Amino acid sequence: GGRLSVDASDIAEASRDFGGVARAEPMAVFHPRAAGDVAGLVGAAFRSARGFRVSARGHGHSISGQAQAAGGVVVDMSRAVARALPVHSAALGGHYVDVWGGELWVDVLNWTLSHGGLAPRSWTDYLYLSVGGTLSNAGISGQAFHHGPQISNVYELDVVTGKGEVVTCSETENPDLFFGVLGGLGQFGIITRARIALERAPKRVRWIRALYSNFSEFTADQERLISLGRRFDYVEGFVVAAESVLYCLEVTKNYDDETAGSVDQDVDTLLGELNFLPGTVFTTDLPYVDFLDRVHKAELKLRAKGMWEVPHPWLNLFVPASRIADFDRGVFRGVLGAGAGGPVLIYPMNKHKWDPRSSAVTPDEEVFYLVAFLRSALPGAPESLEALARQNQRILDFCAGTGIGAKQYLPGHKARHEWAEHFGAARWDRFARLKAEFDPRAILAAGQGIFRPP
Numbered sequence: 273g274g275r276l277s278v279d280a281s282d283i284a285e286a287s288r289d290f291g292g293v294a295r296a297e298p299m300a301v302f303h304p305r306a307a308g309d310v311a312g313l314v315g316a317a318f319r320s321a322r323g324f325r326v327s328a329r330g331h332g333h334s335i336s337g338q339a340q341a342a343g344g345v346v347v348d349m350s351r352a353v354a355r356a357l358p359v360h361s362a363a364l365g366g367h368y369v370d371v372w373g374g375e376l377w378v379d380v381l382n383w384t385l386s387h388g389g390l391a392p393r394s395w396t397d398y399l400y401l402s403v404g405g406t407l408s409n410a411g412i413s414g415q416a417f418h419h420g421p422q423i424s425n426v427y428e429l430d431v432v433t434g435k436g437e438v439v440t441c442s443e444t445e446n447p448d449l450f451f452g453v454l455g456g457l458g459q460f461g462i463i464t465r466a467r468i469a470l471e472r473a474p475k476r477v478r479w480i481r482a483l484y485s486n487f488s489e490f491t492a493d494q495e496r497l498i499s500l501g502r503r504f505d506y507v508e509g510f511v512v513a514a515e516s517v518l519y520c521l522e523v524t525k526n527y528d529d530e531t532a533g534s535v536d537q538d539v540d541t542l543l544g545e546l547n548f549l550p551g552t553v554f555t556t557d558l559p560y561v562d563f564l565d566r567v568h569k570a571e572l573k574l575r576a577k578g579m580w581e582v583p584h585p586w587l588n589l590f591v592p593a594s595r596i597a598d599f600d601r602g603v604f605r606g607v608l609g610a611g612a613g614g615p616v617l618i619y620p621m622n623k624h625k626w627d628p629r630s631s632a633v634t635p636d637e638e639v640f641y642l643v644a645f646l647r648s649a650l651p652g653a654p655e656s657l658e659a660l661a662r663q664n665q666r667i668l669d670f671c672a673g674t675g676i677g678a679k680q681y682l683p684g685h686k687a688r689h690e691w692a693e694h695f696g697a698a699r700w701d702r703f704a705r706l707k708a709e710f711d712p713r714a715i716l717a718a719g720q721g722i723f724r725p726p
């Protein structure tokens with residue numbers, strides 16, 4: 273059904289990612305038409321003498337070669353095929369949609385909006401990411417404190433295991449595979465279908481930004497907002513340079529024709545309870561799609577300046593809320609106190625919205641922060657990348673030296689002792705047992721560098 277390609281442009285694309293550093297080349301790129309084609313290719317890898325590497329590639333947004341299959345085959349999941357319409361279930365008390373694992377979230381959104389004005393409840397900041405790609409990590413943005421990550425908003429999957437078997441799984445059917453695959457770093461199979469939870473979409477968004485010079489007030493306000501009854505629909509934050517540091521609180525209030533009459537007062541009532549710097553509230557009113565696509569708009573401006581296809585040594589940490597104050601002292605004021613620049617995100621989430629049965633690794637605390645160092649290197653300047661990589665190592669050394677129980681999100685670990693420390697004994701045992709069962713020859717997502725063939 274599918275076709276193997278040796279087109280130099282296809283090989284080149286499959287040999288790189290957004291990080292712009294890892295460059296392991298496959299032998300060929302596979303273009304599947306359906307799940308059976310993926311199953312066929314993985315089955316052939318499983319039965320082969322050498323057991324060649326197979327990795328699914330979503331939109332290639334990995335930072336350190338996680339979707340690369342050195343001397344093997346990269347499955348281009350991007351894909352004429354007919355899409356499933358959203359469905360209502362009286363039993364689940366809501367809607368869902370089945371999507372191909374390679375579908376981009378921006379295309380899922382456009383589809384669900386045009387078919388009943390429905391949308392996923394939990395997002396990433398950037399929608400040109402694949403469903404299977406975010407579901408293999410977590411998929412987080414300003415809605416996760418309330419709805420949980422995208423891995424907490426999926427009902428069912430079809431997975432092609434490392435043995436080339438197509439398996440339908442959910443909480444009630446093959447749950448070990450379902451929960452293993454969710455946040456599973458592509459280690460147990462390729463997601464060919466995901467059943468995404470949907471809600472009736474808002475039409476518009478009241479997008480607010482407010483400034484803080486006091487980090488204690490900033491974090492106290494973020495933590496109070498995520499515990500909220502009247503509440504914001506989105507809670508994020510970012511660190512801003514003086515032109516020493518400021519913190520920007522970023523919130524939204526979603527609304528439609530029915531709630532348009534109460535949005536101004538809901539916002540004013542919520543903002544009144546906060547302690548941001550007076551006169552620093554910036555507001556925008558825009559369609560829901562436009563708000564969700566905000567990072568793609570930043571992307572177009574970077575592409576125009578030749579500032580998009582540069583190295584991205586991005587670092588993402590989950591930091592226990594009990595250690596966030598020390599974190600600002602030694603990192604935002606200490607280590608960072610730049611390259612082409614880029615955002616430094618910071619916002620808390622509620623651990624109870626994350627199912628503990630999944631493969632996702634979070635700190636052992638009820639409230640934890642995402643701290644995202646999204647700094648880009650200068651174009652064609654290798655020394656800028658090297659200086660940023662040294663800064664990233666200083667941040668990790670800071671966490672290690674003061675015993676901050678931080679965990680990397682999209683973990684860039686390479687050594688077995690680093691992976692054992694990341695997971696901890698209980699989670700590592702569960703992870704290794706799932707690998708022995710679903711990918712014994714370690715064919716899948718070998719670019720993650722967790723397992724090697726036996």
Ligand SMILES: *Cc1cc2c(cc1C)nc1c(=O)[nH]c(=O)nc-1n2C[C@H](O)[C@H](O)[C@H](O)COP(=O)(O)OP(=O)(O)OC[C@H]1O[C@@H](n2cnc3c(N)ncnc32)[C@H](O)[C@@H]1O
Nearest residue numbers: 330331332333334338373397398402404405411412458463
């Ligand atoms: C580049 C980028 C990334 C990003 C983001 C904004 C940008 C500009 N915003 C994010 C956000 O707000 N929140 C968040 O949670 N993540 C965000 N990211 C990171 C992004 O989630 C990751 O890069 C992720 O890997 C998804 O990206 P993509 O769709 O491109 O997937 P990939 O890089 O090619 O592959 C990642 C790993 O998963 C395996 N894989 C890929 N597809 C599948 C399927 N269908 N089934 C199973 N495994 C799959 C790859 O082999 C690789 O190991």
Ligand SMILES: COc1ccc(C(N)=O)c(NC(=O)Nc2cc(Cl)cc(Cl)c2)c1
Nearest residue numbers: 397412567570586588614615642644646
């Ligand atoms: C230059 O590209 C930009 C510009 C702006 C943003 C933003 N405002 O969120 C943006 N946001 C992200 O990339 N967020 C994101 C990126 C990763 Cl890799 C992981 C997670 Cl938790 C968040 C990227």
